[PDB]
Structures are given as C-alpha cells and as structure tokens.
Amino acid sequence: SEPQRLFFAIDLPAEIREQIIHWRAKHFPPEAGRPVAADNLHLTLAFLGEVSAEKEKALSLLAGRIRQPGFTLTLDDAGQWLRSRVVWLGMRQPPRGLIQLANMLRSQARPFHPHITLLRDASEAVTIPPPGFNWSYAVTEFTLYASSFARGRTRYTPLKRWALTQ
C-alpha cells in the first residue's frame, strides 16, 4: 500500500504544551522564526522517511518488541541551531531510558540529540532565555506518526502507540 512519511516520537502533556507556547510568545517575536503549533510539539526518537506499508509493518512489529521502563523528562534547557535554523527545548542530562529507546528505534530500521523544536526557519541568532519553571513529566508511551501537509499546515496522524513499562 501507499508509502507514508513516518516517525516515532514522545508527546507532551497538554498543560505543558500550553505553558510552552505562552512562554514562547513571551520571549520570541513572530520575526524570530516560524512557530510550531501547540499540537505539533513533540520529541522525535527516530525519523524514518517515506515508508512502504510493507516496511511500516516490520517497524511496527519490532517497536512492539521493545521492553523499556518509563522515565521522567524535565525540560531544563533551550538553545538554537543556526545550521538547522531551529530554536529548541531540551534536557541537559536526558535519562538513559530515552537514549536507549531512541537508539533501539534507530537500529531496528549524526548522533541522537533529543530536542523539541519550537521555531522553524530561525535563520537569525536570537537570545535564548531558560525554559519556564517545572516542565517535568512522566513518559508512559511512544507513538508512530505519519506527517502530511493539509490546508498549508503540517499535520501529524498517530498510527500506533506502545506503552513503556513502569
């Protein structure tokens, strides 16, 4: 069947997504770059690319084999990558479990730099304040997404999720 544009990701709880966009609006003018919609904020584990229905299944079945306890993410970090033109949110010392999860999903298919992108096309350097306070939460699952382009906007469609253990 049709090839889709796929990726595995960790999502953010709704309250934190809202805190993040309020903070973003407070510290970044619209000129600083193109803002990611609140529902589209996520932390990518592995970008897969265009994927046949065939190899979608083989990746889905192997993600199903992963046996990994949950972990907590605390977003204490923010910065900018000029070459990628992105302003991002991150964790200074991400938990072992996040790295192990991303690596397993990169292997079943540049090194892993877990981040959540806030602004795209941020070609100009800008001042990066620290993140807001207490953006900390338990990761309980990860999701396989398809990305389309609908009405000009980017849309992520959840295909499958897998609970992490705890």
Numbering used by the authors: 2 to 110, 120 to 176
Excerpt from the publication:
We also cocrystallized the enzyme with ATP and 3′-AMP, which are neither substrates nor products. The fact that they bind the active site can imply that they may be weak inhibitors, and it can be taken as evidence of a general propensity to bind nucleotides in the active site. Two similar datasets were collected with ATP, one of which has one ATP bound to only one of the 2 monomers in the asymmetric unit. This ATP molecule probably has a partial occupancy and/or some degree of flexibility, as evidenced by residual difference electron density. The other complex has three ATP molecules for two monomers; the space group remains the same. In addition to the ligand in both active sites, another ATP in the latter crystal form is bound in the vicinity of it in one monomer; this ATP is also involved in crystal contacts. The binding of this second ATP is a strong indication of a propensity for binding further nucleotides in the active site vicinity by E. coli LigT. Residues interacting with the second ATP include Phe159 and Arg6. Again, the α-5′-phosphate of the active-site ATP is in the same location as the corresponding phosphate in NADP+, and it is similarly coordinated by Arg6, highlighting putative RNA recognition features extending from the active site.
The 2H phosphoesterase superfamily is an ancient group of proteins and protein domains characterized by a common fold and a few conserved active site residues. E. coli LigT is a 20-kDa protein that exhibits 2′,3′-cyclic nucleotide 3′-phosphodiesterase and 2′-5′-ligase/phosphodiesterase activities, but the biological function of the enzyme is unknown. The LigT structure presents a typical 2H phosphoesterase fold, in which the catalytic residues reside at the beginning of strands β2 and β6. As in other 2H family members, the active site has 2-fold symmetry; this symmetry also includes the 4 water molecules at the bottom of the active site, connecting the active-site β strands through water-mediated hydrogen bonds.
